[PDB]
Swiss-Prot record, chains A, B:
<dbReference type="Pfam" id="PF01322">
    <property type="entry name" value="Cytochrom_C_2"/>
</dbReference>
<dbReference type="GO" id="GO:0005506">
    <property type="term" value="F:iron ion binding"/>
</dbReference>
<feature type="binding site" description="covalent">
    <location>
        <position position="116"/>
    </location>
    <ligand>
        <name>heme c</name>
    </ligand>
</feature>
<feature type="binding site" description="axial binding residue">
    <location>
        <position position="120"/>
    </location>
    <ligand>
        <name>heme c</name>
    </ligand>
</feature>
<dbReference type="InterPro" id="IPR002321">
    <property type="entry name" value="Cyt_c_II"/>
</dbReference>
<comment type="subunit">
    <text>Homodimer.</text>
</comment>
<dbReference type="GO" id="GO:0042597">
    <property type="term" value="C:periplasmic space"/>
</dbReference>
<keyword id="KW-0479">Metal-binding</keyword>
<keyword id="KW-0408">Iron</keyword>
<dbReference type="InterPro" id="IPR010980">
    <property type="entry name" value="Cyt_c/b562"/>
</dbReference>
<comment type="function">
    <text>Cytochrome c' is the most widely occurring bacterial c-type cytochrome. Cytochromes c' are high-spin proteins and the heme has no sixth ligand. Their exact function is not known.</text>
</comment>
<keyword id="KW-0873">Pyrrolidone carboxylic acid</keyword>
<feature type="binding site" description="covalent">
    <location>
        <position position="119"/>
    </location>
    <ligand>
        <name>heme c</name>
    </ligand>
</feature>
<dbReference type="GO" id="GO:0020037">
    <property type="term" value="F:heme binding"/>
</dbReference>
<feature type="binding site">
    <location>
        <position position="12"/>
    </location>
    <ligand>
        <name>heme c</name>
    </ligand>
</feature>
<dbReference type="InterPro" id="IPR015984">
    <property type="entry name" value="Cyt_c_prime_subgr"/>
</dbReference>
<feature type="modified residue" description="Pyrrolidone carboxylic acid">
    <location>
        <position position="1"/>
    </location>
</feature>
Length: 126, 126
């Protein structure tokens, strides 16, 4: 869907910005600093689910640019493992949200965050 | 979810960028320049549905900035009519996609596009 590599870069950066907001806005809730409304969180995690599937198709070959490290492309398999594993942590977060299980939500939220950082430390430029 | 108005601006711009890509990538399909795969289009319009609900909550009072015209805030009701009407055009597009009805998809796509432009001509800076 991208006319030039720059369009893929802009798309993925925008998608990642939106995940970050839908993930990070729950921090006060998981810390207990803001109240826990199970329905609110269920709905927000559904949005996050949708968004978390979107970036990867915008790292399609030849789309070097942005702050993407080149290693995304020279080992397609390891990067794919990374994103698929991240998405499966999102599945655990969805399960916790759908169950209205706060304890499970806290644990899943931490594991998701660790997954974000694991990818950045291998694949995003400093 | 925004610490400063700039964060709302960045969110909405990113959300709008993603809609634009999920909307515009269907142009070749509705023109017949690319093939019509009903399942592909159904799935893409579901993504567009999700995305098309997101920008509006990031124009929450005091978030002047970006290329948003000030009139978004001085008449909350007219802007709301605009976004809600846009979202209902998205509903028609979803119905057409879910039905696998190409003719309906073409018509709905044009009406969605007109709705985007109607909002821009009142509420986005040139
Ligand atoms: C690899 C499998 C990743 C996972 C999982 C997550 N992110 Fe990431 N992110 C990744 C790359 C390669 C990049 C650079 C993209 C580019 O081309 O520049 C990024 C970038 C971001 C950004 C900045 C986006 C921008 O505006 O430029 C943010 C805010 C971000 N990532 C957030 C984020 C969060 C919160 C994640 C887990 C919920 C997450 N990312 C996962 C690679 C990967
Ligand atoms: C009002 C109800 C709108 C409707 C419907 C659509 N858009 Fe729009 N758009 C609107 C505003 C007020 C702005 C400015 C936002 C800001 O603070 O700068 C925009 C902007 C965009 C952009 C640019 C985003 C960026 O990267 O800065 C794009 C690509 C865009 N809009 C696309 C777009 C499409 C394709 C729409 C219909 C499918 C659509 N918008 C509807 C207001 C409104």
């Amino acid at each position: 869907q991208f006319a030039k590599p720059e369009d893929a870069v802009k798309y993925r950066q925008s998608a990642l910005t939106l995940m970050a907001s839908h993930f990070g806005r729950m921090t006060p809730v998981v810390k207990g600093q803001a109240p826990y409304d199970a329905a609110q969180i269920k709905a927000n995690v559904e949005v996050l689910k949708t968004l978390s599937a979107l970036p990867w198709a915008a790292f399609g070959p030849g789309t070097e640019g942005g702050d993407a490290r080149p290693e995304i492309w020279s080992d397609a398999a390891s990067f794919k493992q990374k994103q698929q594993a991240f998405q499966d942590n999102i599945v655990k977060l969805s399960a916790a949200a759908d169950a209205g299980d706060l304890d499970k939500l806290r644990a899943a939220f931490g594991d998701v965050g660790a997954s974000c950082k694991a990818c950045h430390d291998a694949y995003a430029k400093k």
